[PDB]
Amino acid sequence: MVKIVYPNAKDFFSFINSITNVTDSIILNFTEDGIFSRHLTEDKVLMAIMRIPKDVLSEYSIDSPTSVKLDVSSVKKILSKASSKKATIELTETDSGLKIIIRDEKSGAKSTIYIKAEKGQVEQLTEPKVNLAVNFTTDESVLNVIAADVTLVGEEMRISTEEDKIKIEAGEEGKRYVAFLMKDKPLKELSIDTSASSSYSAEMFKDAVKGLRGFSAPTMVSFGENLPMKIDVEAVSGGHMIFWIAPRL
Amino acid sequence: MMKAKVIDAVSFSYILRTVGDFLSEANFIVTKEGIRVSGIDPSRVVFLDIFLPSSYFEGFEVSQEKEIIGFKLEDVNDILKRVLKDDTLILSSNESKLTLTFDGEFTRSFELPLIQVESTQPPSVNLEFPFKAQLLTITFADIIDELSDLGEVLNIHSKENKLYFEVIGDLSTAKVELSTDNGTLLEASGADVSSSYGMEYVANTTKMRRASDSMELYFGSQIPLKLRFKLPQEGYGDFYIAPRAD
Ligand SMILES: [Ca+2]
Asked: InterPro entries of this UniProt entry (chain B)?
């Protein structure tokens, strides 16, 4: 069995919403190190990874590493009960699946979600064994504007290294778009180990940026020449939500 | 090669949104004196004429005396839909492209290849109108917005210098009086006339409230309605709407 208590309910719901952008069923993996989910758009281009370590959890206890399979119904069942309120989640493994207790902070009382789920064996975390040349940090607001800019003009986003700035372009025919991101306009952070240009499905960028919805935290983006793009955010109350995007070779 | 910088992008984007209700495509006529946009709608009922003097812009430069810029209205307006409210906008051009540049919290540009838009002739402004009135753009907008959803035909008439807007719809009729007597009109002079115009065309122009604070209204019997939307730098937005079968 597994017993967990979550200090931030609002984040817990943000996470499940996130993984939704890549899958409609969700495998939660309970290891001795914590909770992790990892799923892939099934043409392999976009990856959603949720990583939540023990220490950020108010209470975490297991008999043995297990996984749980939340089918399309169970996800809808969990998300139907989502809220931005300050609340506590108590999650335990039960015989027929999971039991989730939501207890807010003001007004105190609690409703219980019974979840039907098959147990399984824990998979392990294969995180792309590449560290990328280009590195930068901004927020969700900035990425959202870009996602909707490129979409309006093309199906593909070509991200390029230029000097002291990041160049983003789209448009296949004649109608075109170029944005320049630089240090403090609007970036809080920029690092260029070496020069790089890669290309991605603009609509897989959209889906990834979309998976930042409920997170307040700043967002790290990284990429390399004809290499994948990682998009990283650390939830205010603990874990990381990560997306990777396989390039158009 | 031309460059123009508008501070109030919002109240500029609504001007272009209003033009797009009447024209699919148009020319920017760029001169030392400013930019002009003129055209007749496909139904040949409405002629519009927008002049944005150089004063309307912050940066304003040209490489020639006369530059013709052909654009689709949907394509430009789709772009202006991405404005970010603290974005200062720049219009820019060269031999092949019109560029719209959003700059503020960060810099972004959208490119449109130039298109071949057939030139426009009025021709030629000035007949005069037996009636003239001045009023707040908002007053006009408040009134046209209510009436616009009641029927197809707007009846406008003047009596003893008071102005009357009327719609007879399938479910309701509304008639409203404006006058200087209670400041609903700022100024109002002319003869007792009467005309009627397509509500649809007239109602399209209320978005100008967002770019214009003051306006002039001209008309007469069996003659077009002239709507002059006064813009801040002696600029204007002119809408001439043909009368109905009299
Ligand atoms: Ca209305």
From this structure: DNA_clamp_sf, Pr_cel_nuc_antig, Pr_cel_nuc_antig_C, Pr_cel_nuc_antig_CS, Pr_cel_nuc_antig_N
CA distance B243 to B222: 6
* Contact predicate A225/A217, CB 8 Å: no
Q: What is the CATH number of domain A1-244?
A: 3.70.10.10
Q: What was the resolution (in A) of this experimentally determined structure? A: 2.6
Residue A224, Cβ neighbours under 10 Å: how many? Answer: 20
Going from N- to C-terminal start, the domains of chain A cover: 1-244
Q: What angle do CA B150, B152, B153 make, to 5 degrees?
A: 105
CB-CB: which of B78, B84, B111 is closest to A152? B78
User: Which residue range forms the structural domain that includes residue B124?
Assistant: 1-246
Give the 3-state secondary structure percentages of chain B, helix then strand then coil, rounded to 5. 20, 45, 35
Amino acid at A109: A
**Coil, strand or helix at B138:** helix
Write phi, then psi, for B44 (nearest 5 degrees).
60, 30
Give dist(CA A104, CA A142) in Å, integer.
32
Helix (H, G, I), strand (E, B) or coil at B15: helix
What CATH code is carried by the domain that includes residue B104? 3.70.10.10
For every residue of B50-79, DSSP letters joined together read EEEEGGG-SSEEESSS-EEEEEEHHHHHHH
Interface test with A, best of B77, B84, B101, B108 (most A CBs within 10 A): B108
Domains identified in chain B, total number:
1
Round to whole Å and give the CA distance between B16 and B22: 10
